[PDB]
Amino acid sequence: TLAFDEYGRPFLIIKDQDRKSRLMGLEALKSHIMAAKAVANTMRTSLGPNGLDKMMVDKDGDVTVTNDGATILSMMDVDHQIAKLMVELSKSQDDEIGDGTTGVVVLAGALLEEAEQLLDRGIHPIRIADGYEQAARVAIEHLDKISDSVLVDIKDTEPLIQTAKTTLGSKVVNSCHRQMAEIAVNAVLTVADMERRDVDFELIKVEGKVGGRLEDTKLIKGVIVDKDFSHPQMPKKVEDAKIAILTCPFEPPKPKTKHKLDVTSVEDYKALQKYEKEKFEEMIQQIKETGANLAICQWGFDDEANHLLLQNNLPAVRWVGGPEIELIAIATGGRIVPRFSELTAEKLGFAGLVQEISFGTTKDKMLVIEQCKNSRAVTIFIRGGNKMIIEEAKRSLHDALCVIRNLIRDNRVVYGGGAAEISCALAVSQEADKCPTLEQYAMRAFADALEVIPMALSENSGMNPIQTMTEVRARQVKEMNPALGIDCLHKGTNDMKQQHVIETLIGKKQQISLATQMVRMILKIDDIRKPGESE
Amino acid sequence: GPLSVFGDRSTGETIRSQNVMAAASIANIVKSSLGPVGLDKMLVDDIGDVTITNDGATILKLLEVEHPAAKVLCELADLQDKEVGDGTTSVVIIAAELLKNADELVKQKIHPTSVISGYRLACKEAVRYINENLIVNTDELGRDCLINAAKTSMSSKIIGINGDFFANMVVDAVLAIKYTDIRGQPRYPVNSVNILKAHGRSQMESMLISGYALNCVVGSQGMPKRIVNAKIACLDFSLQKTKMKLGVQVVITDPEKLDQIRQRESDITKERIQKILATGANVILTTGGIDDMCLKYFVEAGAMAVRRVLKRDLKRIAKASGATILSTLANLEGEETFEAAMLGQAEEVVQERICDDELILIKNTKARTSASIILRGANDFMCDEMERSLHDALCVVKRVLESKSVVPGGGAVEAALSIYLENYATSMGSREQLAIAEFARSLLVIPNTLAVNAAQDSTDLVAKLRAFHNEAQVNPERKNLKWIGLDLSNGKPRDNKQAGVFEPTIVKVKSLKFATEAAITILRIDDLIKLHPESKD
Amino acid sequence: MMPTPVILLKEGTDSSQGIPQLVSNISACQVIAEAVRTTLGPRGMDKLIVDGRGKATISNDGATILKLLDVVHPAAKTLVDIAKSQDAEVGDGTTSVTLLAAEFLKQVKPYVEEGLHPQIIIRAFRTATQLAVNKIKEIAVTVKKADKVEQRKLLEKCAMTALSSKLISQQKAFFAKMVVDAVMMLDDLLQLKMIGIKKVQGGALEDSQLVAGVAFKKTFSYAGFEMQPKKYHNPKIALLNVELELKAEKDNAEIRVHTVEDYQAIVDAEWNILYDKLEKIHHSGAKVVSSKLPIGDVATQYFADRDMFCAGRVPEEDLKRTMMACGGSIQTSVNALSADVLGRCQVFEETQIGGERYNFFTGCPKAKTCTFILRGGAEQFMEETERSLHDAIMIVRRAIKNDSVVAGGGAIEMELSKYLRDYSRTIPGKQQLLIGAYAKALEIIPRQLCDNAGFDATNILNKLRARHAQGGTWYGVDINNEDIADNFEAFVWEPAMVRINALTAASEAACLIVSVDETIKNPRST
Ligand SMILES: Nc1ncnc2c1ncn2[C@@H]1O[C@H](COP(=O)(O)OP(=O)(O)O)[C@@H](O)[C@H]1O
Ligand SMILES: Nc1ncnc2c1ncn2[C@@H]1O[C@H](COP(=O)(O)OP(=O)(O)O)[C@@H](O)[C@H]1O
Ligand SMILES: Nc1ncnc2c1ncn2[C@@H]1O[C@H](COP(=O)(O)OP(=O)(O)O)[C@@H](O)[C@H]1O
Ligand SMILES: [Mg+2]
Structure with missing residues (x-):
């Protein structure tokens, strides 16, 4: 018996074993599938362009309406260790590619649902997991058949816009489906290093301010910071700005150590007045000798230095952030100068229309940089009607900035809309008979689970799943298999090449690879050692 | 998703390991009370009652259990008393070791239905081998078989003396109650021996009363307490005043007729007491009640009247003394006849001194010459132990006289079956041979427990025990080593034929049949569902 | 009701005695052996243990599962310490040491309930163990043609079986080739701190790589890192232990000034102190x-x-690996910088693996270290991949200094049962029931290779005992086919010291459980 021996002695193995939970049985694998299918059935309704959004409420009461699969599973309070691995699966897709975070959870729940009927037939769970590796290898090699792109980043941006429209077509930015798609294309190509095929997202600043509409979202080539002119009579428009970027506060120079400067006579106190009076005239003249007409400072200003800016016609901002001035020196081509004595004409930045824009009745007055000269840093200014449509557009356009980054890493594409999943399901079924020795049932469960993603698009579009999928799959066997999928309004024919539904190759290559390995770590587990109550 | 039952469900090898520990929790208790080197226990209740016993049935009946696999072994000991009567520590150890060795088989991914079918091929072969390897019936040994079989049962209890005092009283008790039946059935009803207890002198003063020992008093202290050449009148009706029934009421319309009805309730009562006493009856036994008015007629006439005796005691007296159990008046519309020729007979009815109580004895009863045993012990705890040890000793000589066949005790049967079943598993064994091979190792726990409780050598004495039994089966040179047992006082294998260690045949045949059948039911608890207690709703 | 003194025994302590104590210790080791029972063999599952804080750790190693159970039983802690010492001595003997030591107690469990004072069992366990560790050394094969391609193939077969029973199914030919190439780049010390295993979330197991140099995680920088491009064809690395800040203060300096002409000279000197250190790093390449x-x-x-x-x-663990990669030296003082203290590489870029940036070094031929970057889909997935990588590294670390290997699976554990049953039939006494019980206890290693996937384990042991008594001595259990197979010809190899330290630690643990007769526990637990 438990907690007692046959000789009457107490039988205690581990501490607090009465409040423990242990399941080996045959339902330990069944509890992992029913916990993972409910996550996949939740994310099934938010797939495709007809996917409905979800309303997420934080612990503080903040409400965020999200549609991407990365932020939905991350903002949950799920205390289930099987469903916690589905959160890290959608997070791993966002960190690597960042487009199929919703589809990688429905695919992982589809592989576990097909493995439930295979488990009742007597197949070992590692034998299903070894059969999924031999089946996912066919889906990787078949996905690299038809793949071509003609992007040159000069004038052939038409494959780049249609690739970003597939990512933005499922979000709430379909009103700006042509305007905002061209923003994310030009924001990547101006900051990407084509010699190394590396894109840095630190150069792409994504800012948002309430007011206006979604059509007022513009791609500002430069930087957008909160302007903090210390003088209210400062000119709010500079036509040709020689920007003097400095990191020294407008003050007498204070050392970093303890000084305790001694004053003995009245000649030393009169020397204190002439020291600071000549220091504020030296820090102002050393900027005017370089020909500068705009100053950026990280730290604060003194009141004595504020009026000397207006007398010399030198506008200056105050209290700029850390990485904000790092974006100014790249957008203007200037250098960040530590002191005032190291200022020169070569370390100045070049900019055109430097002005602040007031938005309605607020007092923000953000910076707008219209003209530049070969900048490697852009800033997207997202506007909207409320904060729910702006924070989602920051998440929607970030997925559009990632699919252009994946095209520079790999210039091979596929055709989405369920066209690649039906074509990959036929490749596993053709190799299931070559040979059907042991893993015949494990490969057919992989092909039946790959058809869940295109049949979820038929369910959200108001069609029938088994009626529409049987028509599309039969047309790819009777002839050579084209880019044949589905759509919501269906655009006439079902040809994905004519409807311009273009997805990246490495996006769907990591959808099958990550969902197979996450299934292998939740099939190769036969015990749960969770505790009982909290305290 | 899962089952929505409000109780508790445990599947797999969890219950398959819990039932073995439930059976081993009972076997490890009674392992210290087996054989002549076994020791008694103490059973203390919550109210303060102390019960000192070593029998396998009295311990497990008073002990509370909760597990469903534990109630099978506790009810297995209760069946051994009715079927055999001394075989009720050995069945519990075998039936728990049958589950311990079968648990090692089902952990080797062997199906339990092959273990159940493998146990039936070994249980039926064990009864077949023990019925073809007996020594002799009760004709060659004579009275030496009944005494030596009685001393084997007493060796595990408080009456295991070196002499033959308690052994001769049991054989003389069963041989005096030989009741014949139809179609040649010499039955020996051992329940007719009234076993009485009294805290008196030592165990060597236990009287063997040839007759019956009634546990009652005379009542009125004016009757002669010793009647020689007595005539027992066994009757069952209350000798009280004539009370009318519910349907009869006394509605008098004349005041002169009042006192004649009041005297009629005692005149009809005394009319029965004068016609049962004028026929020479001196001893009157009554299961009802004799009130103080009717006790005068026995003091005046000089007769003994015993009131409020048991109904089970009146049948043992009237059958042994030739008396007729009469409940009312009878014999073809007769007023008061009583059938005086059907009175009982007795040589002497004497109330002796039983250490500050009154006990009535009947000497030889003149018709059947029955027997009753009065036990004498130090305290009441020894008298309850002496009663249980004597009742198990009466059941041993009952089965020997009925079924004239004895087997050697002290592990001699379990040693011969441990080697014959290993050769039996090799001949016709394809997939169930592992269950027959573990049936032989489970039977070896009976000589193994005799070596543990004696603090002797364990893995060498039993290894020397089966060395003689192996040569008695593979070397046909008339070695006659089938009766090799254990000498627990010396620590060497001895011959149980000359030593006088005899046990009945059905104390091991019914033990191997009940332990194998109980091991099948506990082997099929692969799934167990326990619901919540429905007490307060 | 018996003990009622005026002064008690010690305080309130309970202590068992004799034969019910010993069966209480044997049955306690059977319960803790079930947590490593289903983790044996390539068809063995893993286990997930959650603590009170909610941290989930999924693993199948015996040194990882048994340390998270929080076992407070005194006799059951002996099986946890032999799983810790197997990871400290071998690295891949873990689940097999705990389960075999529990069978040494279960085979004598019907023997300790019936007499058999345990000094005979300790003497029989030490006798059978010394004969078992000697027959391994007399049968472990070796080669005399090392420092060639044949020795590298011997290291790869021992790493594929070490990567077996892990969370790796088809990546055995990819990962174990990198484990052998990792230890051959090291020096003649085989230090585990000279190889970095860093987990990057995002990517499949095929996206992992073995960097010939080093790579750090690109920690918290300042304004100026979006500049300084990462294209270097032959750079030099300056490993420093100095602060490059303006506020470098010795925390006891009080600069008392008297005039304003000398006050500005102190502030100009504080910039000249920092700029003189930057000129020492400059003009040196x-x-x-x-x-x-x-x-x-x-x-x-x-x-x-x-x-x-x-x-x-x-981090200081990364700079020690960086020093052995480029072949330089870490200079705390910048005044002694020269060409002999700077590093040299070929390719130094900052990539975007897994979203986070990583500055990796590559191209240095005099690399005494390496870095194995892991890419997975979960944080617990890469922790199991790191734990499976340490088992394959510590097998191939010990295989270089001792290249004597044996057959994998239950091939050695079955033939040691043959040599011990033949030895038990040549000695008289009570040791026939103990040496033979020690031989039957070794047959559970081919049992757990079959009980985890069915395989009809009763019939497959009759084929193993017949093949070892007739022909070869390396026949074991095949995993793909449900039959016996020669594990030496099927390249299922393991080093000989894996099973030597397994039989030594399991016997000394089993001799400790049978030697304790009293267990006294004091009630003061605060
Ligand atoms: N015009 C279209 N026609 C058909 N299918 C489409 C169209 N646009 C998008 N889809 C489908 O909608 C799905 C949206 O997936 P999504 O939720 O964005 O993945 P992730 O969560 O990884 O970003 C894609 O798999 C794609 O096949
Ligand atoms: N003189 C003796 N020598 C050896 N063994 C004996 C002797 N007397 C009794 N035994 C053994 O002691 C055991 C007592 O069993 P017991 O507990 O009476 O069974 P039950 O509980 O069914 O009555 C018997 O099985 C018998 O073999
Ligand atoms: N290809 C294979 N075929 C058969 N058996 C294998 C194979 N690979 C590994 N095994 C078995 O799996 C077992 C894994 O043991 P393991 O848990 O690694 O021990 P430890 O915990 O000491 O590292 C080994 O004993 C080995 O016999
Ligand atoms: Mg999308």
Whole structure:
């Protein structure tokens, strides 16, 4: 018996074993599938362009309406260790590619649902997991058949816009489906290093301010910071700005150590007045000798230095952030100068229309940089009607900035809309008979689970799943298999090449690879050692 | 998703390991009370009652259990008393070791239905081998078989003396109650021996009363307490005043007729007491009640009247003394006849001194010459132990006289079956041979427990025990080593034929049949569902 | 009701005695052996243990599962310590040591309930163990043609079986080739601190790689790191232990000044102290700067103007690997910088693996270290991949100094049962029931290779005992086919010292459980 021996002695193995939970049985694998299918059935309704959004409420009461699969599973309070691995699966897709975070959870729940009927037939769970590796290898090699792109980043941006429209077509930015798609294309190509095929997202600043509409979202080539002119009579428009970027506060120079400067006579106190009076005239003249007409400072200003800016016609901002001035020196081509004595004409930045824009009745007055000269840093200014449509557009356009980054890493594409999943399901079924020795049932469960993603698009579009999928799959066997999928309004024919539904190759290559390995770590587990109550 | 039952469900090898520990929790208790080197226990209740016993049935009946696999072994000991009567520590150890060795088989991914079918091929072969390897019936040994079989049962209890005092009283008790039946059935009803207890002198003063020992008093202290050449009148009706029934009421319309009805309730009562006493009856036994008015007629006439005796005691007296159990008046519309020729007979009815109580004895009863045993012990705890040890000793000589066949005790049967079943598993064994091979190792726990409780050598004495039994089966040179047992006082294998260690045949045949059948039911608890207690709703 | 004294025994302590104590210790080791029973063999599952804080750890190693159970039983802690010592001595003997030591107690469990004073069992266990560890050394094969391609193939077969029963199914030919190439780049010390295993979330198991140099995680920088491009064809690395900040203060300096002409000279001197250190790094070719101490905004913008890269707040474990990769030396004082203390590489870029940036070094031929970057889909997935990588590294670490290997699976554990049953039939006494019980206890290693996937384990042991008594001595259990197979010809190899330390630790643990007769526990638990 438990907690007692046959000789009457107490039988205690581990501490607090009465409040423990242990399941080996045959339902330990069944509890992992029913916990993972409910996550996949939740994310099934938010797939495709007809996917409905979800309303997420934080612990503080903040409400965020999200549609991407990365932020939905991350903002949950799920205390289930099987469903916690589905959160890290959608997070791993966002960190690597960042487009199929919703589809990688429905695919992982589809592989576990097909493995439930295979488990009742007597197949070992590692034998299903070894059969999924031999089946996912066919889906990787078949996905690299038809793949071509003609992007040159000069004038052939038409494959780049249609690739970003597939990512933005499922979000709430379909009103700006042509305007905002061209923003994310030009924001990547101006900051990407084509010699190394590396894109840095630190150069792409994504800012948002309430007011206006979604059509007022513009791609500002430069930087957008909160302007903090210390003088209210400062000119709010500079036509040709020689920007003097400095990191020294407008003050007498204070050392970093303890000084305790001694004053003995009245000649030393009169020397204190002439020291600071000549220091504020030296820090102002050393900027005017370089020909500068705009100053950026990280730290604060003194009141004595504020009026000397207006007398010399030198506008200056105050209290700029850390990485904000790092974006100014790249957008203007200037250098960040530590002191005032190291200022020169070569370390100045070049900019055109430097002005602040007031938005309605607020007092923000953000910076707008219209003209530049070969900048490697852009800033997207997202506007909207409320904060729910702006924070989602920051998440929607970030997925559009990632699919252009994946095209520079790999210039091979596929055709989405369920066209690649039906074509990959036929490749596993053709190799299931070559040979059907042991893993015949494990490969057919992989092909039946790959058809869940295109049949979820038929369910959200108001069609029938088994009626529409049987028509599309039969047309790819009777002839050579084209880019044949589905759509919501269906655009006439079902040809994905004519409807311009273009997805990246490495996006769907990591959808099958990550969902197979996450299934292998939740099939190769036969015990749960969770505790009982909290305290 | 899962089952929505409000109780508790445990599947797999969890219950398959819990039932073995439930059976081993009972076997490890009674392992210290087996054989002549076994020791008694103490059973203390919550109210303060102390019960000192070593029998396998009295311990497990008073002990509370909760597990469903534990109630099978506790009810297995209760069946051994009715079927055999001394075989009720050995069945519990075998039936728990049958589950311990079968648990090692089902952990080797062997199906339990092959273990159940493998146990039936070994249980039926064990009864077949023990019925073809007996020594002799009760004709060659004579009275030496009944005494030596009685001393084997007493060796595990408080009456295991070196002499033959308690052994001769049991054989003389069963041989005096030989009741014949139809179609040649010499039955020996051992329940007719009234076993009485009294805290008196030592165990060597236990009287063997040839007759019956009634546990009652005379009542009125004016009757002669010793009647020689007595005539027992066994009757069952209350000798009280004539009370009318519910349907009869006394509605008098004349005041002169009042006192004649009041005297009629005692005149009809005394009319029965004068016609049962004028026929020479001196001893009157009554299961009802004799009130103080009717006790005068026995003091005046000089007769003994015993009131409020048991109904089970009146049948043992009237059958042994030739008396007729009469409940009312009878014999073809007769007023008061009583059938005086059907009175009982007795040589002497004497109330002796039983250490500050009154006990009535009947000497030889003149018709059947029955027997009753009065036990004498130090305290009441020894008298309850002496009663249980004597009742198990009466059941041993009952089965020997009925079924004239004895087997050697002290592990001699379990040693011969441990080697014959290993050769039996090799001949016709394809997939169930592992269950027959573990049936032989489970039977070896009976000589193994005799070596543990004696603090002797364990893995060498039993290894020397089966060395003689192996040569008695593979070397046909008339070695006659089938009766090799254990000498627990010396620590060497001895011959149980000359030593006088005899046990009945059905104390091991019914033990191997009940332990194998109980091991099948506990082997099929692969799934167990326990619901919540429905007490307060 | 018996003990009622005026002064008690010690305080309130309960203590068992005799034969019910010993069966209480044997049955306690059977319960803790079930947590490593289903983790044996390639068809063995893993287990997930959650603590009170909610941290989930899924693993199948015996040194990982048994340390998270929080076992407070005194006799059951003996099976946890032999799983810790197997990871400390071998690295891959873990689940097999705990389960075999529990069978040494279960085979004598019907023997300890019936007499058999345990000094005979300890003498029989030490006799059978010394004969078992000697027959392994007399049968472990070896080669005399080392330092060739044949020795590298011997190291790969021992790493594929070490990567078996892990969370790796088809990546055995990819990962175990990198494990052998990792230890051959090391020096003649085989230190585990000279190889970095860093987990990057995002990517499949095929996206992992073995860097010939080093790579750190690109920790918290300052304004000026979006400059300083990462294209270097032959850079020099300056490993430093100095602060490149303006606020470098000795925390006891009080600069008392008297006039305003000398007050400005102190502030100009504080910039001249920092700028003199940057001129020592400059004019030496050291384009890459690495320091474990932070660098402020001044020295970050100085290197961006001079087209130099820097990296501050580097961990000390990464700078020790960086020193052995480039072949330089970490200089705390910048005044002694020369060409003999700077590093040299070929390719130094900052990639975007898994979203986070990583500054990797590559191209140095005199690399005494390496870095194995893991890419997975979960944090617990890469922790199991790191734990499976340490088992394959510690097998191939011990295989270089001792190349004597044996057959894998239950091939050695079955033939040791043959040599011990033949030895038990040649000695008289009570040792026939103990040496033979020690031989039957070794047959559970081919049982757990079959009980985890069915395989009809009763019939497959009759084929193993018949093949070892007739022909070869390396026949074991095949995993793909449900039959017996020669594990030496099927390249299922393992080093001989894996099973030597397994039989030694399991016997000394089993001799400790049978030697304790009393267990006294004091009630003071605060
Ligand atoms: N015009 C279209 N026609 C058909 N299918 C489409 C169209 N646009 C998008 N889809 C489908 O909608 C799905 C949206 O997936 P999504 O939720 O964005 O993945 P992730 O969560 O990884 O970003 C894609 O798999 C794609 O096949
Ligand atoms: N003189 C003796 N020598 C050896 N063994 C004996 C002797 N007397 C009794 N035994 C053994 O002691 C055991 C007592 O069993 P017991 O507990 O009476 O069974 P039950 O509980 O069914 O009555 C018997 O099985 C018998 O073999
Ligand atoms: N290809 C294979 N075929 C058969 N058996 C294998 C194979 N690979 C590994 N095994 C078995 O799996 C077992 C894994 O043991 P393991 O848990 O690694 O021990 P430890 O915990 O000491 O590292 C080994 O004993 C080995 O016999
Ligand atoms: Mg999308």
